[PDB]
Design a protein around this ligand. Structure first.
Ligand SMILES: *[C@](O)(C(=O)OC)[C@H](CC(C)C)NC(=O)[C@H](CCCCN)NC(=O)[C@H](Cc1ccccc1)NC(O)O
Length: 464
């Protein structure tokens, strides 16, 4: 049973859910899932459940940003409910590998040197890092944190809500969650919308290169706008932009020792590492809302300051004013590694490097060494709980996949194939943002509410 308690931002409820760690072993140890219920304001059909994806994103978090941008009529007919998944912030037990020192220390480095020693150093630190987890977390737990178990929890959630079928909205990784449960309880699904799609069938390397081109495309599109604007810090020449970009970012690195960071002055005591110069960029590429923020931090670097770019990185890392991180960084990795088998082969990583440098030159520093470090998950001790495959969910309600044309994170073609793999209705947004639902856009939310209450899918090839 769910005892709902107040907490402090709306008309919101709070609870926790007992779920087992191993569903094979449902008698040993139990998680407690953070929960938040926003009641409906009219006649209700049920609870809509959202998830921001990540993985790592607090469903308690998103559900408040969403609350402000929630259609009048949706609010009326649904309990908006959000939740931290198993290990997420309030959700106990939470995942902890790195300390704050651990993180700041890492981000103090430029991470560009792929010489053998430079590759040697990274994975050494990858190594010491993995031990922290198991030291502080117990290897047993880390196996069962795959989305495979998350789906079973999501099912237990619906039951806890008195819904008989589920109403769901998933962002980014949330879509990989959606598909899981979809393959799992296709009958326990009332309606479903997925935004920023993730394709389980895809090869994990090709995917990352899709994301590379996806961000360079976004970069092309930012600089094309800025270069029309007055005083573009990348010049008004969008061609030469990446160059100017590099002219602004390369000196954050000593051109004679690639381990030495020469960080830009900031009021904040940290200055700006090359690593973080790049992270803030990716940040602002996620949505055009953050592009002025970009134009700022660049003009900063022009004058040698990095304060803006420094804040974007934090927003990506979710490192608060007081310097505390939330565990979303740690969480991200743990789940990735169980969710699918890592790339064990060295050659193929080194080659992915070689290619990606060409595919996304603004991100890649200086010269291709001939070497790249293996991914973090290639060290993972608990095995992938889940397998890359095409989705097989046959008797499922028509749903709405949504992908933005120039989405840099989850590329548009991801939404394409996922929809195909679901035989469902697709919704296209012309834009260079990741996600878009309930973010000020009248058109999308019409269709969404239509499919939501009304259950009405967009036409064949609807485009807003
Ligand atoms: C999605 O779940 C989302 O937008 O959540 C914020 C999305 C799902 C796929 C991975 C796109 N996740 C992200 O975009 C995630 C951001 C989470 C930040 C909160 N602390 N970022 C990534 O997965 C990294 C994006 C990226 C890709 C290429 C180059 C640089 C950065 N992926 C890297 O870890 O590879």
């Amino acid at each position: 049973p769910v005892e709902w308690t107040p907490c402090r931002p709306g008309g919101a409820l709070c609870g926790k859910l007992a779920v087992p760690v191993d569903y094979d072993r449902p008698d040993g140890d139990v998680a407690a899932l953070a929960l938040i219920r926003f009641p409906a304001t009219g006649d209700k059909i049920g609870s809509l459940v959202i998830n921001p994806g990540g993985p790592g994103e607090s469903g308690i978090e998103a559900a408040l940003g969403v609350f402000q941008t929630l259609p009048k009529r949706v609010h009326e007919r649904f309990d908006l409910v959000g939740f931290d998944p198993r290990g997420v912030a309030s959700s106990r037990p939470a995942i902890w590998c790195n300390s704050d020192a651990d993180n700041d220390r890492l981000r103090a480095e430029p991470q560009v040197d792929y010489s053998r020693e430079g590759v040697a150093h990274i994975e050494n630190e990858t190594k010491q890092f993995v031990g922290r987890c198991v030291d502080k977390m117990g290897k047993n737990f880390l196996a069962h944190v795959g989305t495979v178990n998350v789906a079973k929890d999501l099912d237990a959630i619906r039951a806890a809500l008195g819904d008989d079928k589920l109403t769901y909205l998933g962002y980014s990784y949330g879509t990989r969650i959606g598909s899981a449960y979809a393959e799992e309880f296709p009958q326990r699904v009332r309606a479903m919308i997925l935004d920023g799609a993730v394709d389980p069938n895809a090869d994990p390397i090709e995917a990352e290169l899709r994301q590379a081109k996806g961000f360079q495309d976004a970069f092309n599109n930012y600089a094309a706008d800025c270069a029309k604007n007055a005083g573009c810090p990348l010049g008004a020449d969008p061609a030469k932009a990446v160059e100017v970009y590099h002219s602004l970012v390369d000196p954050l690195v000593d051109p004679d020792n690639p381990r030495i960071s020469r960080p830009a002055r900031t009021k904040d005591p940290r200055g700006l590492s090359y690593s973080d110069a790049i992270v803030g960029t990716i940040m602002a590429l996620y949505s055009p809302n953050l592009w002025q923020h970009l134009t700022d931090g660049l003009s900063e670097l022009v004058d040698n300051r990095g304060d803006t770019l420094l804040a974007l990185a934090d927003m990506y890392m979710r490192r608060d004013s007081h310097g505390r991180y939330n565990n979303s960084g740690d969480a991200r990795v743990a789940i990735n590694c169980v969710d699918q088998p890592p790339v064990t082969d060295r050659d193929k990583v080194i080659d992915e490097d070689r290619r990606a440098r060409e595919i996304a030159p603004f991100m890649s520093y200086g010269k291709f060494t001939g070497d790249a470090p293996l991914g973090t998950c290639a060290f993972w001790p608990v095995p992938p709980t889940s397998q890359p495959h095409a989705v097989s969910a046959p008797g499922l309600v028509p749903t709405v996949v949504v992908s933005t044309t120039h989405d840099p994170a989850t590329p548009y073609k991801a939404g394409v194939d996922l929809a195909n793999q679901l035989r469902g209705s697709l919704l296209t947004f012309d834009g260079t943002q990741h996600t878009v639902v309930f973010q000020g856009d009248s058109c999308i939310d019409e269709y969404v509410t239509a499919y939501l209450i009304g259950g009405t899918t967009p036409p064949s090839g609807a485009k807003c």
